[PDB]
Write a structure and sequence with these properties.
homodimer, alpha+beta, 3-stranded mixed β-sheet, Magnetosome protein MamM (chains A, B), metal transport
């Protein structure tokens, strides 16, 4: 049941300003830890710099709320 | 490691309007489920009716965020 932990990741990410959905989330256990890779949607008219700031906020928010995560790589794509 | 689940319960409860701390939290596993009893602090000058509303909001907030909880009994005491 990774459903429970993935549901938490998504919820957490979605509550960060500028996230327009979670497009992708791959999470796996490395021992008792989670390592994850996520793609978020953002406004296409955000700058690249803003997109990088939103990714960094999501990394902070998600890692703050889900203490078992030990690696979280966040990227962004335009979403309408 | 019930520390992780109890930390989540407390955080969740503390973010509900009118909670002035978690005074007490007993949580235990009943199979894979959590059953818990909690006392929250509230403003002494809240009415008894308001205190009951805050308890009901905490029950909702906590059970909404921690899906493994299958019983949560919330009571209130005055806290300055």
């Amino acid at each position: 049941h990774m459903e429970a932990v993935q549901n938490r990741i998504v919820e957490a990410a979605e509550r960060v300003p500028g996230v327009r959905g979670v497009i992708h989330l791959r999470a796996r256990y490395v021992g008792q830890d989670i390592w994850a890779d996520m793609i978020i949607g953002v406004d296409p008219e955000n700058t690249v710099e803003q997109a990088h700031e939103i990714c960094e906020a999501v990394q902070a928010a998600v890692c703050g709320k889900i203490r078992r995560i030990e690696s979280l790589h966040v990227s962004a794509e335009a979403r309408e």
